[PDB]
Amino acid sequence: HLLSLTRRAQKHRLRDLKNQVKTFAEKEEGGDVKSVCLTLFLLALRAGNEHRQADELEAMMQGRGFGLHPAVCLAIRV
DNA sequence: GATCTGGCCTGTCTTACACAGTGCTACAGACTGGAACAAAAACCCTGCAG
Ligand SMILES: [Ca+2]
Structure with a gap:
């Protein structure tokens, strides 16, 4: 599985999908790969009704506040 | 020693005061997938405007 392996x-x-996202993000968002994979993570978590991890x-x-x-x-x- | 009466009894009537808050649980209320929609937001792009 992908989750137990090292980063190498x-x-x-x-790397195929990494460079796919690289070229598509330089196509659409103009040098913003981080927000592209962020929106992908948010959609992949919300499609599965796990809104809680997306909120975290x-x-x-x-995030608004660590402390109150x-x-x-x-x-x-009171 | 009757008489009458101020006053006292009692019965009834009216307005007040504690009765939260605590666990269970069901329901409706919120979230999504394709199709497709319309309606506005803001630049760009053109005209009809002097
Ligand atoms: Ca009261």
């Missing part, structure tokens, strides 16, 4: 064999196996991902990619503002904290407290 993973990239060796996937979006909370990692410039003291205000809403006091709110929850």
Whole structure:
């Protein structure tokens, strides 16, 4: 399987689709491969009704808050 | 010692006050796949405009 292998064999196996995404992203988005594979990951996770992992991902990619503002904290407290 | 009466009893009537909050669970409410749609957003592109 692809998930247990090292990065050498993973990239060796996937280089075809890696350069496919490379050329398609330089075609459409103008030098943005990272956001292209991000939108691909989001669509592949939402098609399977696993919205939770997509929400965690979006909370990692410039996520609003690791920690909370003291205000809403006091709110929850009371 | 009757008489009448101020006042007291009792019965009834009216407005008030604690009865949350806690686990279970079912339901409706939200999310998607192809087809296909219309309706606007904003540049570009042209005209009819002086
Ligand atoms: Ca009351």
